[PDB]
């Protein structure tokens, strides 16, 4: 691989989570020459090995401030590891639940613009994410949000992606809408109290999630635009970013 790193340059500290393929740790990465940095470390059939590491191969393609950075991989020895830049505030949904009502509308829009820029980048690189959700976005101490996570998540998924089991950047726009709703509701679960079948039923009857408490109308309307049934009518991510940039420069619109 590239970003291949010798395991001797890796200091594992606290276990912080439980992964599909094993433990996730906080630690430090000291490559000689380079400054020591802080990393999250995922540790691991050959099938499962190849799979585990595929996210490093995919993540290795990207460089953008709102896309999680691959700092390194260990594939020459055991355990196999994936090292990413450490994000101190964890997953966006739980971070917002912890801070319910405590960030301004401007701050929240900045988080959403960050995510939309990350997505604009992915779409530009013809990469379709398929599981864009607040739980798959990470947050650092400066509140910078980064897309992560490189069997259908029903409530985040566009109707046509559910119907055809095929995904596009326009289906990612739908998911982005759900993510806006999650942010402005401070990490409430989409369709709070509904089962998956209830949600699909609702969406087919043209039900849409309402404005979250205290949510400016301009933001909720952009959600509804991302949730247009015709996927061609949905804004592309350059347009999502432009629309958020307008609100930011005219922030009486965020009253
Ligand atoms: C499955 O648990 C899991 C998966 C992936 C990560 N990756 C990662 N990469 C960079 N930074 C972080 N920081 C985190 C992530 C957290 O949960 C998602 C988290 O709360 C446990 C946290 O707290 C300090 C930091 N994570 C991490 C994890 Cl746990």
From Swiss-Prot:
UniProt keyword Isomerase present: no
Keyword NAD among UniProt keywords: no
Subcellular location: Cell membrane
Molecular function terms, GO-annotated: ATP binding; ephrin receptor activity; transmembrane receptor protein tyrosine kinase activity
Active-site residues (renumbered): 131 (proton acceptor)
Domain Protein kinase per the UniProt entry, residue ranges: 10-255
Superkingdom of source: Eukaryota
Annotated consequence of substituting residue 234 to W: In CMAVM2; the mutant protein is not detected by Western blot; loss of localization to cell membrane
Outcome recorded upon mutating residue 152 to S: In LMPHM7; loss of kinase activity
Gene Ontology biological process terms, A to Z: angiogenesis; cell adhesion; cell migration involved in sprouting angiogenesis; ephrin receptor signaling pathway; heart morphogenesis; protein autophosphorylation
Sites where the protein binds ATP: 16-24, 42
Protein keywords: Angiogenesis, ATP-binding, Cell membrane, Developmental protein, Disease variant, Disulfide bond, Glycoprotein, Kinase, Membrane, Nucleotide-binding, Phosphoprotein, Receptor, Repeat, Signal, Transferase, Transmembrane, Transmembrane helix, Tyrosine-protein kinase
Cellular component GO terms, alphabetical: cytosol; extracellular exosome; extracellular region; plasma membrane; receptor complex
Tissues expressing this chain: Abundantly expressed in placenta but also detected in kidney, liver, lung, pancreas, skeletal muscle and heart. Expressed in primitive and myeloid, but not lymphoid, hematopoietic cells. Also observed in cell lines derived from liver, breast, colon, lung, melanocyte and cervix.
Biological function: Receptor tyrosine kinase which binds promiscuously transmembrane ephrin-B family ligands residing on adjacent cells, leading to contact-dependent bidirectional signaling into neighboring cells. The signaling pathway downstream of the receptor is referred to as forward signaling while the signaling pathway downstream of the ephrin ligand is referred to as reverse signaling.
Entry's disease: Lymphatic malformation 7: A form of primary lymphedema, a disease characterized by swelling of body parts due to developmental anomalies and functional defects of the lymphatic system. Patients with lymphedema may suffer from recurrent local infections. LMPHM7 is an autosomal dominant form with variable expressivity. Some individuals present with severe non-immune hydrops fetalis, which may cause perinatal demise or fully resolve after the neonatal period. Others present with no edema and have milder clinical features, such as atrial septal defect or varicose veins as adults.
Family: Belongs to the protein kinase superfamily. Tyr protein kinase family. Ephrin receptor subfamily.
Subunit architecture: Heterotetramer upon binding of the ligand. The heterotetramer is composed of an ephrin dimer and a receptor dimer. Oligomerization is probably required to induce biological responses. Interacts with RASA1; the interaction depends on EPHB4 tyrosine-phosphorylation.
Protein name: Ephrin type-B receptor 4
Shown chain mapped onto the complete sequence: 606 to 885 of 987
């Amino acid at each position: 691989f590239a970003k291949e790193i010798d395991v001797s340059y890796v200091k594992i500290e606290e276990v912080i989570g439980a992964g599909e393929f094993g433990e996730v740790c906080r630690g430090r990465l000291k490559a000689p020459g380079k400054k020591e940095s802080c990393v999250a470390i995922k540790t691991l059939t050959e099938r499962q090995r190849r799979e585990f590491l595929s996210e490093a191969s995919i993540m290795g393609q990207f460089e953008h401030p709102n896309i999680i950075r691959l700092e390194g991989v260990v594939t020459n020895s055991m355990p196999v590891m994936i090292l990413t830049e450490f994000m101190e505030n964890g997953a966006l949904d739980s971070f917002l639940r912890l801070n319910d009502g405590q960030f301004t509308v401007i701050q929240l829009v900045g988080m959403l613009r960050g995510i939309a820029s990350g997505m604009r980048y992915l779409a530009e690189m013809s990469y379709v994410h398929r599981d864009l959700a607040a739980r798959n976005i990470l947050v650092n101490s400066n509140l910078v949000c980064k897309v992560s996570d490189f069997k259908i998540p029903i409530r985040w998924t566009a109707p046509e992606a559910i119907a055809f089991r095929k995904f596009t950047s326009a289906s990612d726009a739908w998911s982005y809408g759900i993510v806006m709703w999650e942010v402005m509701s401070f990490g409430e679960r989409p369709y709070w109290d509904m089962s998956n079948q209830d949600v699909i039923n609702a969406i087919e009857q043209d039900y849409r999630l309402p404005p979250p408490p205290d949510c400016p109308t301009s933001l909720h309307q952009l959600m509804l635009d991302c949730w247009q049934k015709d996927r061609n009518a949905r804004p592309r991510f350059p347009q999502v970013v432009s629309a958020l940039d307008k609100m930011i420069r005219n922030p009486a619109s965020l009253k």
